[PDB]
Point group: D2
Chain length 431, copies 4
């Protein structure tokens, strides 16, 4: 059982609480698209752990490689090179778009974002950063200064030069030009305001291709491209945060690949390490070169460690080989359809959005009003869990709560169906 008093006792005595609430169970094992509690109950992992496990849990390939390096080459002095590093770095230059030539291998997403940010600041010699008002980039310093979906309060001033502008949001639009949502005019209007506040030290814009924590918000048609133009015009880098969208989750190796818009720095992590702590940034040779001339420094314990590098390489391998970017499209499409059927069935479902296997479902109380349904989302979620489906809903000011659905790229069709089912039941049972 899940009731080990000792377990819960220590848990209560010795854990720092760091947000949300602990799931009332004890996970004892995980494999593929499931986790198993202490009763051996199998739980369908519709979020791939914390939105990371694209290969699923305990992937035999990973398990293989992990072992190899653990026993062969684990960790080294940060000034020593090894093959996994150069290989992974090289693979990355290779699978990313053109213009992305050199990589730096780290440990976390926020870390990856801090590296990028520091780099833009170094090469521009400026420090003002602009993000979206519903963004998430990490808990640390700079990444946190640019995160607006949450965390801004009660912990001192943000970094000097922090700005946000609204994310283009088709589902809940607020900028009309001629009786229609002109999100491109919204962008302009936001930028002028920014331009008016700047001290003249705009260094970069950071953006998630699809805002996840922000409620699965997809940058609409040509926005990304217009955005790059705002940056270029201002002598700013555009940094694309692909912690969750990267590595084939949206059914392209990299989301930025869909818009055909290549950023100045691309950051990776969650899906790169597929559950393990490995991250990276990728920049142009020109940018890398100037950073270097200017003395760029981003030296850590784990930068360039062989074991993690090895793990990411294997992940990229397996993804490539097992043709998982496409599987994300197939399954995603299988899932969307189901979500849309449910939506047919249930009025509380106000929106089915997202891409590939990064889908979002927006719970509303009234389709015409899109009145957020209060408590309803929490219910569905509670219910999914009982029914044995791990889910995640995010709730920001102004919108219905959103289910963030992101199963493993390796998920099966039945697993999808199974999931779609538990969900159907959870909603039925929650109304």
């Amino acid at each position: 059982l899940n009731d080990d008093a000792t377990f819960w006792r220590n848990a209560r005595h010795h854990l720092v609480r760091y947000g949300g609430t602990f799931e009332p169970m004890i996970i004892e094992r995980a494999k593929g698209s499931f986790v198993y509690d202490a009763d051996g109950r199998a739980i369908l992992d519709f979020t791939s752990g914390q939105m990371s496990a694209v290969l699923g849990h305990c992937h035999p390939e990973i398990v293989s490689v992990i072992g190899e390096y653990a026993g062969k080459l684990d960790h080294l002095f940060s000034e020593m090179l090894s093959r996994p590093v150069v290989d992974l770095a090289t693979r990355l230059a290779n699978i990313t778009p053109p213009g992305l030539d050199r990589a730096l291998l780290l440990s976390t997403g926020a870390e990856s974002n801090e590296a990028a940010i520091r780099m833009a600041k170094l090469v521009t010699g400026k420090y003002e950063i602009v993000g979206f008002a519903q963004s998430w980039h990490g808990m640390t310093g700079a990444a946190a200064s640019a995160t607006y979906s949450a965390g801004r309060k009660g912990v001192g001033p943000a970094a000097v030069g922090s700005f946000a502008i609204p994310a283009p949001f088709t589902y809940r639009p607020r900028f009309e030009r001629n009786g229609a949502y002109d999100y491109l005019a919204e962008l302009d209007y936001a930028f002028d305001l920014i331009d008016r506040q700047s001290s003249g030290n705009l260094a970069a814009f950071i953006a998630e291709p699809i805002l996840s924590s922000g409620g699965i918000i997809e940058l609409p048609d040509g926005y990304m491209a217009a955005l790059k133009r705002k940056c270029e015009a201002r002598g700013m880098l555009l940094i694309l945060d692909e912690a969750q969208t990267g590595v084939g989750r949206t059914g392209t190796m990299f989301a930025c690949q869909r818009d055909g818009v290549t950023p100045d720095i691309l950051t990776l992590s969650k899906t790169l390490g597929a559950g393990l702590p490995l991250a990276a940034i990728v920049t142009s040779a020109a940018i890398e070169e100037r950073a270097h001339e200017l003395g760029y420094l981003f030296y850590t314990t784990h930068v360039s460690d062989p074991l993690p590098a090895a793990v990411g390489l294997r992940v990229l391998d397996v993804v490539q080989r097992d043709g998982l970017v496409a599987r994300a499209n197939v399954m995603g499409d299988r899932l969307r359809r189901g979500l849309l059927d449910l939506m047919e069935r249930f009025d509380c479902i106000g929106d089915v959005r997202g891409r590939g296997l990064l889908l979002g479902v927006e719970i509303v109380k009234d389709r015409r009003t899109k009145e957020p349904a209060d408590g309803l989302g929490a219910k569905i979620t509670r219910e999914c869990m009982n029914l044995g489906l791990s889910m995640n809903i995010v709730q920001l000011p102004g919108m219905g709560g959103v289910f963030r659905i992101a199963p493993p790229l390796t998920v099966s069709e039945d697993e999808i169906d199974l999931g779609l089912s538990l969900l159907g039941q959870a909603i039925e049972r929650a109304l």
Copy 2:
């Protein structure tokens, strides 16, 4: 060979440079107190990788556990608990001093420091942070704002409310009270200045028990304790950064254990993960409780992931079981003695300092003057490498460069001797 042109070519085309210079070799394997290049040359790892591998490389225990969890329980949604987490958290409450009750399990040292810092800020409701002027806490946001040994330049304003005061440094003292180094009066004098600059929002003081990157600078007798008193008097937390001093490196599980001075938050990482990416903070139940009331948030992909948790637990186990804190004292003492013999032999050796197996050697040009010997340090280092001993020297304004010597806690006596020897030769050959 180490000349694989392809290797070096890609390395040149695809790596972002992030500080220092790449060692001209290709590390192909590592085991125990050695790394091996592409020729199979065995290199004596006198820094335990990047000052992390207390168990040495590829420790069979680690290799065991790594495998287990990789294939059993890897990564989970951050709201799900599992045993390694609670166990490690519990172990930590247990082996740390009194007053340290609850832990948070993360991925990196800077991450660990950011968590701590944010926590102090949350509970004090203030934001000014004070560190030592030769500190190192990480590359990220807040950790970087409090790092003064380097990195402050060319990357925008530091965080609002950043201060430093000089570290008590016996080897090179600058505050005299009655014809003697009154480092305790220095502390007072520094604090008054701080008090005069504060906006009245002093939240914490952060400190390394022994400044490593800063040149193996040990806080002298009663300083730590006086320091805690400065904090207490100001309503500030004292955060102790034990990324490298922790986990028995200085011959106590935790350096703060030596002074009998327990901090408000203790951070751990490097030696905790023993090469793997795992970190932690530990605080009092009272502090944890208030943080929680105030909504403390520090939510990451890898917080509470079972695999890393598992790895740290095993590390603590093995350290305990194999009685490595003591081995650090034995070996350390074996090494110090040798360093002191060399010092007898060579005048360029102006100082042998540090504790346990965290020793520092300060290169000078003249003992009477303690004139830093220019280029000499770099030479010795170059030479050690040829002789097959990996070394690390750090150089700050005002001092001779310092060798940071920190072999694995598992190192053998011959390995020590061997090392002491290569060093003797490197110096001979460098003069």
Copy 3:
């Protein structure tokens, strides 16, 4: 003549340049609505000096009082009270709206704004300030941090916590709700963005009732009132900057009197000192009381100096007695009509706006396009000067340049006509 080489020589050798360009003449005397050059040429002062002389130049009443105190009571230790101070302070409590009870007497407008701002910060215990994106509050610290019409660049970071939102601008509207300019919805939309960026430390909103330097932009119907509501809802003070709108310039003693919306702090200066250096802030007894409890401090050399206090009292007197707030309405109305006739005559005149004797004229190249007419404004201005009429045009990104017309409240009708004429000619001659 105006060519005194010596004069111009020294002027060139010994003056720090501080913006704009020096008028090529030498002002030798001033009286009423004119200044006279070194040739004795009379220049019609359509801006009342630097938008200050509501009584005109060298007002006999002022000249009287100035003398009195100069020879009777000039300057005192800031802890000594005298009658002019208490009288003026009292007069102010008396003529200002309800809710405004206590005054602080200073020297400059920026000074007045800094006092207010510091006060809001003290009583809220917060520090984030929000202004309009085309505002002007002064050159100093905080006033400059909240000034967005200009000056933000090349002089370091602005104050921590600085924000702006767009000013409601009917002439050039950019926020449409249902095929119309919903400036009230714009306000909401701006505030949400602000709310999303705040660290949770919103202390105040500062605003000019009519943006002058910003291009004579009048807050439209009910905006001010909605704004106050944004502040109230957020626990923020609303500070109204009436440096130029105050003291009857807009045909009400205080512009805020028109909307029937009373701010938490009101600041005064330009028109208060009527050319002399005297300023003030006025707050509620409740606010004053709390500031005091919290130790409010704003101690200067000239706070509470009798001479200036005396001068302002006399100004208020004379304004009252000579019924100048009304004269501002009469003359203003006389002037608007003329401006509108010109507008009839000339297409380059795209807008006649403002209130009382604070009128603005927006030069455009095409009425349909409202394309700013480039160089045209500068011409008209040059021409006015030749014709003997001192004018002022302000030019911000996105708009035609604007003439800021603000003659003395004491101006005569013929003087108005005269002015309207020189202008008619200047435009004719500039096309």
Copy 4:
């Protein structure tokens, strides 16, 4: 009488309290070295109003000039030049040292300091400012960020990049080098710390030649000069704040004249306007030129207003003509001697310091201990007042309270004697 209830009533209802406490009297007139209450009691003004009236109160010369311009040329558009301006600007280039060529004419001391500071920032392109830990520069933005004697608390973050270092203080020394106060080594030591905290954006150092509000602290022999060297070495401007030391108060036109060390920008105000609101900054032609190239802007209502300019010119005149810088030396010396006699008489007098007519008297409880005498200072002061001598004591952490004695440069010998007497009595009567 001083009891006008109405007076006190309104005073209570309508005055914002802004620091300290109101003197319980009603000043009705002032002339020469006295102010007179409502009973006609004559009070000996030992602080020249708020340390401003070098000509004394209601100086007939001033009264003359004030009238002239009031009725002739008062205030103008900031782009119009007139003779008083150019004349005063020229006079200033003339009486100041070499290297000081161009002036900017403003209204207040803080204003003057903000102009200077902004200028340094513009020309260095940097923003970090360093001052003394017991400084006073003004209540506004930047001036307040650099003021450390008080005001730092409860009003938000200071400006980004604010630093202080300790002022060299012979009376109460805390840095010993070889059994002696090495204040020059203190300076070095402070600067290294600063160097370690800087983001590499040191723009200027600001300093009062003698810290007044800070307790009449005179920069010792060669310090100023060493300081200039710190700045030069760092590419920083040295800005000298001479609000009170300037204009012959210390018995040199400008205190910096004594050390033969000329700053990059010199600011003036208090004694320049001799009670009226007029200030100025003076810089080198080279600096002015570069500021200008870079677009320097510091545009105010009262910059370059003829009336105030006129008043300062007259002040400089009269000072020159009436040979008041020397009178400051004579009288000062007359006063010091008396203070030293008192000191002979009373043990509570621990220190007689200062220069010219800017003397300070430090009250202590024990000469050997220099234990600040608590309440004693306040007593003496209370007593002086009863005896009819207006005095001012300032009290900072760590020192006895200090009387700041600064009578008019025009003061007479008997007036000095008279003062020395009331003081003798006040102390007698306070013990």
